[PDB]
Amino acid sequence: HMCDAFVGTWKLVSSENFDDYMKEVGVGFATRKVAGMAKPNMIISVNGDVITIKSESTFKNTEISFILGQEFDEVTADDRKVKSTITLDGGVLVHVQKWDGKSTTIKRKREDDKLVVECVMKGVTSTRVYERA
Ligand SMILES: NC(=O)c1cccn1Cc1ccccc1Cl
């Protein structure tokens, strides 16, 4: 029942500072423009200890499955090949991606009826808000 309040189908309804976050990550112009338009659906499910997060959008469809605390390889939507570890910290899913000596952290939390996604690269944060679909 670890992540019960995350499970479901979620739709992106607002984004702030995502272009600057993607710049800080190293995403190139064309991908930033097209990826910034997307309004993904995020589908979260749990089966035993395995959590699956799917993102479906006009830009890219992605899917990760993982066990908390157990590192896995991830190819991100912008085509980075990263090593990811996701933990639960005080009810927040904390997702750290490592690649090429760099690191970014994505935090996912429930706030009211929203799922709030905070993406941090160095000093730059983007906040992406999802609602139930
Ligand atoms: N994986 C990440 O660090 C991340 C955080 C928020 C979105 N993403 C993937 C992403 C999707 C489209 C374009 C650029 C990127 Cl960085």
Swiss-Prot record:
One BP annotation, GO: negative regulation of DNA-templated transcription
UniProt modified residues of type Phosphotyrosine: 21
One term of GO molecular function: fatty acid binding
Protein residues bound to a fatty acid: 128-130
Entry GO CC: cytoplasm; cytosol; extracellular exosome; lipid droplet; nucleus
Subunit structure: Monomer. Homodimer. Interacts with PPARG.
Annotated family: Belongs to the calycin superfamily. Fatty-acid binding protein (FABP) family.
Name of the protein described by the UniProt record: Fatty acid-binding protein, adipocyte
Upper taxonomic lineage: Eukaryota, Metazoa, Chordata, Craniata, Vertebrata
